[PDB]
């Protein structure tokens, strides 16, 4: 096959590039939460 192979390396491209910016979610964002109700819990 040579044609679902297209679906292979594209996921090998896409998902890793899709894996990317969630490191900034781990990276960028003491206090975290500011609501009067949120601190009741």
């Amino acid at each position: 096959a040579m044609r679902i192979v297209m679906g292979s390396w594209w996921l090998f491209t896409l998902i890793v590039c899709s894996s990317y910016t969630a490191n900034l979610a781990a990276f960028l964002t003491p206090v975290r939460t500011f609501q009067d109700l949120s601190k009741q819990l």
């Binding site: 044609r3 679902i4 297209m6 679906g7 594209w10 996921l11 896409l14 899709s18």
Partner: peptide, 29 residues
């Protein structure tokens, strides 16, 4: 992202159908 594989999927199924179309060209000839 939510639909990154979705938009490319039907493109791949279009590319999937050309192979079996040439195999029906073989089933005719």
């Amino acid at each position: 992202s939510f639909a990154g594989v979705f938009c490319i999927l039907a493109i791949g199924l279009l590319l999937a159908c050309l192979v079996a179309a040439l195999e029906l060209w073989w089933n005719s000839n």
